[PDB]
Amino acid sequence: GSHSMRYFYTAMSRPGRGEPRFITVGYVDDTQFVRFDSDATSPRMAPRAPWIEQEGPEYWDRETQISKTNTQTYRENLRTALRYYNQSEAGSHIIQRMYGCDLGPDGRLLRGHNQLAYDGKDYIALNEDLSSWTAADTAAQITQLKWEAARVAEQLRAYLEGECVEWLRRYLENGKETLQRADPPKTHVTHHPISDHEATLRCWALGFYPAEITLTWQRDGEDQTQDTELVETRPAGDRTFQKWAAVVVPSGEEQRYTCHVQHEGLPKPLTLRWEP
């Protein structure tokens, strides 16, 4: 499979309720492995997966000091954002950032990412070339100019092609028994009468990892996308995920419907139907 590492930063102001909160979570693929929360009693970058616990004190100290600095930097960024949007200090606002690297199946850098949002709207993104910026608005153009002067893209490109890949490969090796193990979905079709005229067929996928999956209903071989209720893929709590897709079918027509499941843990795409 193709692997990725991502850090997610959130800074949330809250006037009248203390200084802005700053959190960091890091993921490899769909596995969270570190967290930082400025609201903690003694804020530290802390492990959230077993395979990172073996990193030495120097690791945790560096991650913590950078995150504590980031707490201060993003409080300053929130103050700056108020000036960039002519906003008052009375309202709550949010800066978000994500960055990291994707590895191809060959294990080399496939692409790098660094994007920010303000109040849930895209703000600035590092372009795929890892050397130019796309600003979303005239405020982000000010940031762009500052980052061009401070060679921010150059530092990011170096990180994303070097350390980010190297650390991701280390994590993948240390957590090989889980990070490099796909768990296929356990799949079933259930039947839920609605009336004497109609019933819901619900195609389930349970216990799969990673989260990426495709579930589709066909009727007589025609995809039923516009007629399928597809819930968002959801965490089970044990690292795996769940999803279902449901169609409303005329009673007695159930055997014309087939559920199709694609997941990288499967040797071949699965086809299921209701088995009464």
Partner: peptide, 10 residues
């Protein structure tokens, strides 16, 4: 491991 990009600012 996180990027050390302290000194970058909005």
């Amino acid at each position: 491991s996180v990027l050390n990009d302290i000194l970058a600012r909005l």
